[PDB]
Design a protein around this ligand. Structure first.
Ligand SMILES: Nc1ncnc2c1ncn2[C@@H]1O[C@H](COP(=O)(O)OP(=O)(O)O)[C@@H](O)[C@H]1O
Ligand SMILES: Nc1ncnc2c1ncn2[C@@H]1O[C@H](COP(=O)(O)OP(=O)(O)O)[C@@H](O)[C@H]1O
Ligand SMILES: Nc1ncnc2c1ncn2[C@@H]1O[C@H](COP(=O)(O)OP(=O)(O)O)[C@@H](O)[C@H]1O
Ligand SMILES: [Mg+2]
Ligand SMILES: [Mg+2]
Ligand SMILES: [Mg+2]
Lengths: 533, 527, 48, 525
């Protein structure tokens, strides 16, 4: 009478390390608690007043940032429900580029309120149906909340003003300068064709001079040196070769069969003459810069130096393709001289040193080109990485604006308006789904609440003021960051705007993740065993 | 203790009633776990692997495979369910439930001193009668689109969310009707199932063509060709080494260059054959070639093809040869010795889609494709896996319905009627096998019980309501999962595959009979 | 036990909303006084 | 679970797991103890850790001697222990009925029924069953024949047939001897002495006492025909002063005088005994036996033997009352005022030597109100088995005497009760009819187990018996030799009414309590 045996049936047949959780308390409440914990971990990094977190992964690498997706990626999340929410956040990052923290916070609030509803008496099916109805209502409402449109994407000032809000959450203090940089870089790209490519914006991180010294270059920068003696060309005529800069050899097996003394004495001289002829044929087309994707032979280098030809050796084929795009050359597969169509052109190619790193610069004087690069300076590697993350967020925002030009007021104004309208709609709806609809509406309060908490004010006063102001009829009013007391101000005139498409996708994904978590009723976890990767 | 333990000391043995107790306990445990899967109102289970992969599922076979169980009887039942899934593609949870209830009902009499042999004899007599009744009750009907839609709904609603099921029904029925040749067996290999991971779950749809998970490897090839000729080939266009160890011998750099230029003549001949065919077929820029190759293409040949405005794909799947020849309508070529415009397929639109680091090529707007693809879209990997399993079940269900014109009313109506018929037939069975017949009928009654239980209603009261309605009316009334009242499953549209029911009866009876007759379990292969 | 658990559960909501616990404690004490008053008000006598 | 979070090293079974665990344990106990029921049951060998051998088919002994560490097993063991302590019979039936009640209840619970409805049905069925038991009991005058029938019905189920036949006469005669009209029966007055020198059939009843100790001084007589019994509780050995006396002398003569004078206190009481003996019997024909609860030192033994007095020392405390009731004297704690009227009389006293142990027999009493049973057997385990059997038989006969009623056995009463419960079932509202049916089926386990142990088949035998009962209305049981229905009253298979009532009450209560348990929890560490 001192031991409780395992119940007969499945409990006894379970494996040695496996776990089985079933029912509300064992499974659903535990999943909700785990998701709430994850949301709490990421909550403090939300908004302009969000705080960076220094995360060290299993490889002893240091990450400091407030980008929610990066933080979740570097955290070794183990609880499977939190894993599902992290997958939702990563999907939001991949689809849009911003709103990962919104997805996480909204999902956490939804799951918390779902636990509340389950405790007061509702069933899982009713809560799920209520959330689905409320999500449909929110997606219907949102297009009516659009305040203005981009209406121009070739203007530097307009694009910078549009992109300021996206890169104000990260790098709050100095966002105008970064906005101008990213606006110039994006306007260089995005030709008359409506298609915009994110990969056409390259980022080069050169350490030392503070991030205020960063600039935008219409071309590319490679952190390497020239093979030859020539180190500067002012009327570049780049000829790109994907093959090694050496005499091509057979593919099965090549052996030099010598049968007489004369052949032995003439072989090396003939090979050298052939290489010289090939290099001179290349040079006679006017080409003065040669870019090769492979190694450079010594004889080829010597003959290129004789004919005053600049040699650059690109290790990665991705860089070779990007250079071909940005110059206008075709990567030849042999050592044949390039025809006039395949010959690339650039305004200036030269070797230069920035800080203590030698770089090769392919610079265009024109305000155009397929590929543009941003040279990031700074006093720390981590700082430059964070600035690069902010640049990526801004570029993704520009891409979204190209896809959809509609914008909604930021600073929690859209969330408060959505909450108010969904609460109004849910009151008219009878049945047991009204509780779920009202909780879905209330879950939108977590965004202004997080903003107010991070700004250091009382969230409740801010939310009450927002409801009041939206009650008179101002739907473009959000909280004011630059105030020590809870206060609100108009966001349309302040320019604090976030993309409509981002909000739409974030709401959809967060709702889907919360519903998917709620649908689970049993968990059968296998023995963790190993799995290093 | 026993003989085996005497001969082999490190042996585990269960004898006489111990074997029956062990087997019945294992069956009861499996049944207790799988009770909650049955029906569209069943609960969704979450499975985490050792590596941490998350799988949301409701399928009985999928759940059984991902169980953390090492029991022998569980292994036997899992094998039976695996066979059921392999052949009919549905009814795994019903299989497990019926086996467990058969064993429980048999034990209910065996514990009263009755021998298992009599129970098995009653089981086989009841199975014969039940098969006769199922033959009587099936609804032979030519199946237009509506009946197939009803069957696909009856499966997919049980597998996934209602709205996702509504989309998947149209998808699966249209695909099956597209690939179905007249009075010919349906080849399910001709429906490619491709997963993309960017849109929502309801964005999955049917493409009247083909989708390939790879794209052109040359940046200069066209990303979208409006009018396209299709060349499906199984010829390697990359460099090939001689089988008999050739090696090259030269005495000068010029000779080496000559040998290098002349070592690609063999491949260049085939490339120029393709180029000549393309120039003969289309002399303008309106049309174009898409060359899908099962074998690789080296960069030289890719460049040579791109210079002529030809998009080429390499390393295609083996099944894609048949799929393209059935969709585009060309001829798969293993050599270019005699290639003519008549062997070229056609496609009304070919374009490439980029998703992250993966390329997808769409071959659609075919004339009358006999092979289509089901593009599965979702935000999560586990969502994609769940949709793929549901689509497999729906495809199997629709194909099963097409195979035989009959279809069986669902919602447990058939089991209720079968149990009543067995009870009526019981006096005709001579001897104590009437006990086995009664046990078989009560075991068949498990499906409405579990359906009513999962729907939240009372079990016994709902079942007696259904049985009373069926007895007084004679109709095939099932369980209405919304109200618990009797409902005519035929009129509403809750249909079940006749082959699935027949397989359930046969396999469940066979395995239960074999298990009941087991009187010893031995593990003495060690040492 | 159930009442104490529920009171702590509902106080957690306020502790997570930037409310100092002393305010919650004062509110709870006022609530307890009014609970005592109401319970004494709705009581009925009994002759033993 | 919730509990495991507070205490990580805690074992918890919750919801249906608790029911499964409890019912599995009950079924295991039932499966073990099925084979015990009825005279056709099977002997069980019980070997302890030290190697002791016990042969028994008693339910309580078997339950205590299995190696079980289960909570439900512990609860059922406690219930059976109470049953044995109060009534002395029905432990095996207790376990069987509890197990069958839980099994029948689970048969309906697994269909989604809530256990509360089952317990309500159990309560209603128990009330109706007690009413029927009151209606069916047979009130009789407990003569010798009826008591013999009851004793046989117990002993035949506990031991071999011929041994049971001997023990019937022994038990019935002892109970009739010690029982005073209109007075509760004191079973402490029946001494159970065991000897290990002859066959098991030599167990008999002695109209007196047998003492496990004999005379210590060799010169005392080994056999006295007519004796006066002096039952006393007075120390006859040297006693030390309570206040640390000590002796002080100055010569050897003084030491001798002090040695002689220090025995005067005990010598006075010895002289009192001797003078009383001389006054009572002035010849050598009569005898004098002194049975003392306290010790007697060798000096006093020698002094008594010089007068031809048999003296026994360190007797059992109960033997004072037993000798007072049998011989008829009075137990004395002092010799201050002793008269020839304080002496009991015995018509024969003799000593029997068995190996290293000696026994004293006190027979031929006038009208012994306290007797002894001499268990005899060649083995220790045989003696233990006979002791358990005679305990059960004495309890059965005492129960039969206590209330003038007796119930027909052989499973007849359970069959009739089940039929009456089924007939009464429609009168029960709600779904408690399911619990009533479960209770009736649980009650039907006794004829089923009897049929199995007799070697027949359950269903056919049970339907034959039920059909006979329905057609005729008589109390028909199970004929363990033919399997046919048989009237238990006519053949003499009787059961104690108190035992049946206790069975019903205890089984219903424990089953109701177990069915209502939804969590088994061990978090005391
Ligand atoms: N100057 C500002 N004043 C008030 N709110 C702002 C301001 N800039 C940005 N926000 C708010 O910050 C939120 C963005 O938070 P952020 O840290 O970018 O999370 P995510 O990256 O998940 O979008 C937006 O909802 C926006 O309304
Ligand atoms: N809409 C519905 N209403 C009532 N019963 C249904 C409905 N859909 C399906 N059913 C019944 O529920 C059962 C579903 O079984 P299912 O969960 O698919 O088990 P398996 O996967 O083993 O086939 C079928 O037998 C069918 O008769
Ligand atoms: N000679 C007999 N013929 C038929 N039935 C009998 C006979 N003797 C006893 N029985 C039945 O067998 C049962 C014996 O139970 P028993 O082994 O004494 O269990 P317990 O020791 O727990 O009382 C009694 O209920 C009685 O009705
Ligand atoms: Mg952001
Ligand atoms: Mg199915
Ligand atoms: Mg007994």
């Amino acid at each position: 009478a001192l031991h409780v045996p395992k119940a007969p049936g499945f409990a006894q047949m379970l494996k040695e390390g496996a776990k089985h959780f079933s029912g509300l308390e064992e499974a659903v409440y535990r999943n909700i608690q785990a998701c709430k914990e994850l949301a709490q971990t990421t909550r403090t990094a939300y908004g302009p007043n969000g705080m960076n977190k220094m995360v060290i992964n299993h490889l002893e690498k240091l990450f400091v940032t407030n980008d929610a997706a990066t933080i979740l990626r570097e955290l070794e999340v183990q609880h499977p429900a939190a894993k599902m929410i992290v997958m939702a956040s990563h999907m939001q990052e991949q689809e849009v580029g911003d709103g990962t923290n919104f997805v996480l916070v909204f999902a956490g609030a939804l799951l918390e309120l779902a636990e509340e509803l389950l405790r007061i008496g509702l069933s899982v099916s009713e809560v799920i149906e209520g959330y689905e109805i409320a999500c449909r209502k929110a997606h219907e409402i949102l297009p009516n909340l659009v305040c203005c449109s981009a209406k121009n994407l070739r203007d530097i000032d307009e694009v910078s003003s549009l992109l300021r809000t996206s890169i104000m959450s990260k790098q709050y203090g100095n966002e105008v300068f970064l906005a101008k940089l990213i606006a110039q870089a994006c306007v260089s790209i995005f030709p008359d064709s409506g298609h915009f490519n994110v990969d056409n914006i390259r980022v080069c991180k050169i350490l030392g001079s503070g991030i205020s010294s960063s600039s935008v270059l219409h071309g590319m920068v490679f952190k390497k040196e020239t093979e030859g003696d020539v180190t500067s060309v002012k009327d570049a005529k780049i000829a790109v070769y994907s093959c090694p800069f050496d005499g091509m050899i057979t593919e099965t097996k090549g052996t030099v069969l010598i049968k007489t003394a004369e052949e032995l004495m003439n072989f090396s001289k003939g090979e050298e003459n052939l290489m010289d002829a090939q290099v001179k044929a290349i040079a006679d087309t006017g080409a003065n810069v040669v870019v090769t994707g492979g190694k450079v032979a010594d004889m080829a280098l010597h003959y290129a130096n004789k004919y005053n030809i600049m040699l650059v050796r690109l290790n990665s084929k991705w860089d070779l393709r990007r250079l071909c795009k940005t110059v206008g050359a075709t990567a030849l597969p042999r050592l044949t001289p390039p025809v006039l169509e395949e010959m690339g052109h650039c305004d200036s190619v030269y070797l230069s040193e920035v800080g203590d790193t030698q770089v090769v610069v392919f610079k265009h004087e024109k305000e155009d080109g397929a590929i543009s690069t941003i040279v990031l300076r700074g006093s720390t590697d981590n700082l430059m990485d964070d600035i690069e993350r902010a640049v990526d967020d801004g570029v993704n925002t520009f891409k979204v604006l190209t896809r959809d030009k509609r914008l909604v007021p930021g600073g929690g104004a859209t969330e408060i308006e959505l909450a108010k309208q969904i609460t109004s709609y849910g009151e008219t709806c009878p049945g047991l789904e009204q509780y779920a609809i009202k909780k879905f509406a209330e879950a939108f309060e977590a965004i202004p609440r997080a903003l107010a908490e991070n700004s250091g004010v009382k969230a409740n006063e801010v939310i009450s003021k927002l409801y009041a102001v939206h009650q008179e009829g101002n739907k473009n009013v959000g909280l004011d960051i630059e105030a020590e007391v809870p206060a609100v101000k108009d966001m349309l005139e302040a320019g604090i705007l976030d993309t409509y498409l981002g909000k739409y996708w974030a709401i959809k994904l967060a709702t889907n993740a919360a519903v998917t978590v709620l649908r689970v009723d049993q968990i059968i976890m296998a023995k963790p065993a190993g799995g290093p990767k | 203790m026993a003989a085996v333990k005497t001969l082999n000391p490190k042996a585990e043995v269960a004898r006489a009633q111990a074997a029956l107790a062990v087997n019945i306990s294992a069956a009861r445990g499996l049944q207790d776990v799988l009770r909650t899967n049955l029906g569209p109102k069943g609960t969704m289970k979450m499975l985490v692997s050792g590596a941490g992969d998350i799988k949301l599922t409701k399928d009985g076979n999928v759940l059984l495979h991902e169980m953390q169980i090492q029991h022998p009887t569980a292994s036997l039942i899992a094998k039976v369910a695996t066979a059921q899934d392999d052949i009919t593609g549905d009814g795994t949870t019903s299989n497990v439930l019926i086996i467990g209830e058969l064993l429980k009902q048999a034990d209910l009499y065996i514990s009263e001193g009755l021998h298992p042999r009599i129970i098995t004899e009653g089981f086989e007599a009841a199975k014969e009668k039940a098969l006769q009744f199922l033959e009587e009750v099936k609804v032979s009907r030519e199946m237009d689109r509506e009946t197939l839609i009803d069957v696909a709904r009856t499966s997919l609603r049980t597998k996934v969310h209602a709205e996702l099921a509504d989309v998947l029904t149209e998808a699966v029925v249209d695909s099956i009707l597209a690939i179905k040749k007249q009075d010919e067996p349906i080849d399910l290999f001709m429906i490619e199932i491709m997963e993309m991971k960017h849109k929502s779950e309801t964005d999955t749809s049917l493409i009247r063509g083909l989708v390939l998970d790879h794209g052109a490897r040359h940046p200069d090839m066209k990303k979208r060709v409006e009018d396209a000729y299709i060349l499906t080939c199984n010829v390697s266009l990359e460099y090939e080494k001689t089988e008999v160890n050739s090696g090259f011998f030269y005495k000068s750099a010029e000779e080496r260059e000559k040998l290098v230029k002349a070592e690609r003549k063999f491949i260049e001949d085939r490339v120029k054959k393709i180029i000549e065919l393309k120039r003969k077929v289309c002399g303008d820029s309106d049309k174009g070639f898409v060359v899908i190759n099962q074998k690789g293409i080296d960069p030289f040949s890719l460049d040579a093809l791109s210079k002529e405005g030809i998009v080429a794909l390499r390393r295609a799947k083996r099944r894609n040869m048949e799929r393209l020849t059935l969709a585009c309508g060309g001829v798969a070529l293993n050599s270019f010795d005699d290639l003519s415009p008549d062997c070229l397929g056609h496609a009304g639109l070919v374009y490439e889609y980029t998703l992250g680091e993966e390329k997808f090529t769409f071959i659609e707007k075919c004339n009358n494709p006999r092979s289509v693809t089901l593009l599965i879209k979702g935000p999560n990997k586990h969502t994609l896996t769940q949709i793929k399993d549901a689509v497999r079940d729906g495809l199997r269900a629709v194909k099963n319905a097409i195979d035989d014109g009959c279809v069986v009313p669902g919602a447990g109506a058939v089991e209720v009627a079968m149990a009543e018929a067995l009870i009526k037939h019981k006096p005709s069975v001579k001897g104590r096998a009437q006990l086995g017949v009664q046990a078989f009928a009560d075991a068949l009654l498990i499906i409405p019980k579990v359906l009513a239980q999962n729907s939240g209603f009372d079990l016994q009261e709902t079942l007696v309501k259904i049985q009373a309605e069926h007895s007084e009316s004679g109709q095939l009334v099932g369980v209405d999962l919304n109200t618990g009242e009797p409902m005519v499953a035929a009129e509403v549209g809750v249909w079940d595959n006749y082959c699935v029911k027949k397989q359930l009866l046969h396999s469940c009876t066979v395995i239960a009979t074999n298990i009941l007759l087991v009187d010893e379990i031995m593990r003495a292969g060690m040492s | 036990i159930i009442l104490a658990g529920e009171m702590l559960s509902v106080a957690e909501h306020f502790l997570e909303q930037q409310m100092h616990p002393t305010v919650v404690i004062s509110a709870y004490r006022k609530a307890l006084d009014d609970m005592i008053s109401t319970l004494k008000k709705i009581s009925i006598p009994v002759d033993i």
